[PDB]
Amino acid sequence: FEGDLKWHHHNITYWIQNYSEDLPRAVIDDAFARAFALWSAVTPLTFTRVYSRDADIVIQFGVAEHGDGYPFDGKDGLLAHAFPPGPGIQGDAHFDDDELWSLGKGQGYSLFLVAAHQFGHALGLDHSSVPEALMYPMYRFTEGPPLHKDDVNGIRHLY
Ligand SMILES: O=C1NC(=O)C(c2ccc(Oc3ccccc3)cc2)(N2CCN(c3ncccn3)CC2)C(=O)N1
Ligand SMILES: [Ca+2]
Ligand SMILES: [Ca+2]
Ligand SMILES: [Ca+2]
Ligand SMILES: [Ca+2]
Ligand SMILES: [Ca+2]
Ligand SMILES: [Cl-]
Ligand SMILES: [Cl-]
Ligand SMILES: [Cl-]
Ligand SMILES: [Zn+2]
Ligand SMILES: [Zn+2]
């Protein structure tokens, strides 16, 4: 799921197609909004929620096979995936609803942190080799600003 294209515009739009049964819709909406805010905080990018399939980043929760040729694997393992910039499915973010979605310390996975990571992918970032960076391919909950200098350097290099 690695690509070589970046968005040719900075006013990015996203559409929350559906939701997970683990969290209230208001909490989900807010987690996604806060995740995007992390990236717009260090770049000239903006993220506007829309209600149309024409959004750049379409967000959906799915289980096992869900359309694209990359079905989820149930509890744990693959948590989600996002397609790099481009038209159509490109740029979209899919979350495995077989996971226990939560926030903060505790069991389950933070939808906030995972979304922030997935949106990094949706923006064209690849994985980071820095263990403490958000783009590091390993889920670990920790307090503190999600973006590491490496993440900031990486996203600014693109936008
Ligand atoms: O697009 C991706 N990219 C990933 O690296 C992914 C994942 C998604 C989001 C993550 O959030 C995160 C990243 C850094 C710090 C805190 C939280 C961490 C890991 N990991 C999850 C763990 N996954 C893995 N798990 C078990 C066996 C093999 N691989 C590798 C991919 C993922 O689910 N989707
Ligand atoms: Ca900004
Ligand atoms: Ca798209
Ligand atoms: Ca899974
Ligand atoms: Ca779930
Ligand atoms: Ca949790
Ligand atoms: Cl729904
Ligand atoms: Cl926040
Ligand atoms: Cl959190
Ligand atoms: Zn998918
Ligand atoms: Zn990743």
UniProtKB/Swiss-Prot annotation:
Maturation and modification: Processing of the precursor yields different active forms of 64, 67 and 82 kDa. Sequentially processing by MMP3 yields the 82 kDa matrix metalloproteinase-9. N- and O-glycosylated.
Residues bound to Ca(2+) 3: D73, G74, D76, L78, D96, E99
Residues annotated as binding Zn(2+) 1: H66, D68, H81, H94
Compartment(s): Secreted, Extracellular space, Extracellular matrix
Binding site for Ca(2+) 2: D56, G88, Q90, D92
Induction per the UniProt record: Activated by 4-aminophenylmercuric acetate and phorbol ester. Up-regulated by ARHGEF4, SPATA13 and APC via the JNK signaling pathway in colorectal tumor cells.
Residues carrying a glycan: N11, N18
Positions annotated to bind Ca(2+) 1: D22, D97, E99
Record-listed Zn(2+) 2 binding positions: H117, H121, H127
Domain of life: Eukaryota
Tissues/organs with expression: Detected in neutrophils (at protein level). Produced by normal alveolar macrophages and granulocytes.
Active site, per annotation: Q118
Annotated disease: Intervertebral disc disease: A common musculo-skeletal disorder caused by degeneration of intervertebral disks of the lumbar spine. It results in low-back pain and unilateral leg pain.
Protein family membership: Belongs to the peptidase M10A family.
Domain comment (free text): The conserved cysteine present in the cysteine-switch motif binds the catalytic zinc ion, thus inhibiting the enzyme. The dissociation of the cysteine from the zinc ion upon the activation-peptide release activates the enzyme.
Subunit details: Exists as monomer or homodimer; disulfide-linked. Also exists as heterodimer with LCN2. Macrophages and transformed cell lines produce only the monomeric form. Interacts with ECM1. (Microbial infection) Interacts with Staphylococcus aureus protein SSL5; this interaction inhibits MMP9 activity.
Note: In the arthritis patient this enzyme might contribute to the pathogenesis of joint destruction and might constitute a useful marker of disease status.
Role summary: Matrix metalloproteinase that plays an essential role in local proteolysis of the extracellular matrix and in leukocyte migration. Could play a role in bone osteoclastic resorption. Cleaves KiSS1 at a Gly-|-Leu bond. Cleaves NINJ1 to generate the Secreted ninjurin-1 form. Cleaves type IV and type V collagen into large C-terminal three quarter fragments and shorter N-terminal one quarter fragments. Degrades fibronectin but not laminin or Pz-peptide.
Protein name as catalogued: Matrix metalloproteinase-9
Gene: MMP9
Portion of the full sequence shown: 110 to 443 of 707
